[PDB]
């Protein structure tokens, strides 16, 4: 579940795991396909699409989806989630505004995007009716068994985590998640790369002049614009899109 910089995250620009990129109000059926940077779906391991894994800390939190809310000018209706990606039936709206409820906090994310829903037809409704003729609209699927396209999803770059840079009672003290690769030095001269377990820092003292980094590329990410490049390489991780636009007859 990637974490990026939401633009108007309740107050202002936070870093939400559900940071909204690639809003697509381009279909007709009241539907938008969205990408959160969060990867809900199965858990970390193997079970139940209808659970909920975002990033809290450096860490995931693969738990229940209980109180998702996509919304716009009005509250939307979820359609389905798969991967980083959710489909939801929305009305028109100047913006798009997404958010779940972890339980202790609202913890939402919101974004600008021009949305409309013309139905296909010479009638310019604002909303799909219960009746009328069927005719060839453009629309996204409910399903996941989907390969019609795939987007590049290679590694994450590093990320900041100054929870690492503690103090060794006079020196600034870095640690490691699980033996992950922490890329480290300070403005002063000390250890210059950092590919280590928990190091200390001989030279500098201040937490605010050091490289708290997490090269933790055991799991790839979506290639968000709000991602810092993993400078090393274009790793593999070509990964499908579920919600292909299909020729449904709305």
């Amino acid at each position, epitope marked *: 579940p990637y974490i990026a910089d939401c633009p108007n995250c309740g107050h202002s620009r936070c870093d939400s795991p559900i940071a909204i990129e690639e809003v697509r109000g381009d279909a007709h059926a009241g539907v938008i396909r969205i990408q959160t940077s969060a990867m809900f779906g199965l858990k970390t391991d193997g079970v139940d699409l209808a659970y909920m894994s975002f990033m809290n800390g450096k860490t995931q939190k693969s738990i229940k989806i209980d109180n998702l809310h996509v919304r716009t000018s009005a509250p939307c209706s979820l359609v389905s989630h798969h991967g980083y990606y959710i489909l939801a039936q929305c009305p028109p709206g100047d913006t798009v505004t997404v958010g779940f409820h972890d339980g202790p906090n609202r913890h939402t994310c919101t974004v600008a995007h021009k949305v409309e829903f013309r139905p296909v037809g010479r009638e310019k409704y604002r909303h799909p009716p219960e009746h009328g003729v069927e005719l060839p609209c453009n629309r996204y699927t409910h399903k996941r068994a989907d390969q019609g396209h795939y987007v590049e999803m290679h590694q994450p770059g590093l990320v900041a985590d100054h929870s690492l840079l*503690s*103090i*060794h009672s*006079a020196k600034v*003290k870095i640690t490691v998640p699980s033996g992950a690769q922490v890329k480290y030095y300070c403005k002063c001269p000390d250890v210059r790369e950092g590919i280590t377990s928990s190091d*200390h*820092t*001989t*030279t500098c003292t201040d937490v605010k002049q050091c490289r708290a980094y997490l090269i933790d590329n055991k799991k790839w990410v979506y290639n968000s614009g709000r991602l810092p490049r993993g400078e090393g390489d274009t790793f593999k991780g070509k990964l499908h899109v579920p919600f292909v636009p299909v020729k449904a007859k709305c």
Partner: antibody
Amino acid sequence: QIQLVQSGREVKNPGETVKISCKASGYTFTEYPMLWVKQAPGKGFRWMGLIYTNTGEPTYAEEFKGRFVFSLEISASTAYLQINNLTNEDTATYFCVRDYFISLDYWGQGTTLTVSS
Amino acid sequence: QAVVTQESALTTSPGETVTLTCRSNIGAVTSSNCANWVQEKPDHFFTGLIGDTNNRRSGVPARFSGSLIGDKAALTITGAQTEDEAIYFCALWYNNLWVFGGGTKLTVLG
């Protein structure tokens, strides 16, 4: 197991230079850098700096940046302290030390310098 | 630019429990100061006891343990012995350099 054995004690008149060796035994030199500590006659213990026995970069304590120069005969597991333009108030004992376990675990025997005409 | 302070001298008897402390002039001592305890026996004989607050060097009797008590680093000798009579120095890390305390002269009956 680990022995850091130091050179013997010198006498030097003011102005001279001294190279104090520290020959390491028992560990792999390269994974543990060296602390140089000055225990001055009265004053107690003071950190002079640390040398990365892997890259070779020294850190000096600010009190020691200048006349003091750390170096190493890597090849022979030796670290060395060189004090140039000896000042009379440098008489004291200098210890090499291994930095490990979030501190220092082994200290050497000491090399005592008596700066005196 | 930090001053480590230690008790000057402490006297105990064989079999007792004695605590030496290490205080930092800048603030409470914390685990990021990686308190080290070093012992000096006569003849300029140095050995490391504890490092990173509570890691006992290998081959240092178990009667020796380190910890943080209040806002300072402490060394406890549980069952002090006659052999423990020496000077104990604490060292604290401060992001880029080490500062040594003045040392505590400990005297043990025996």
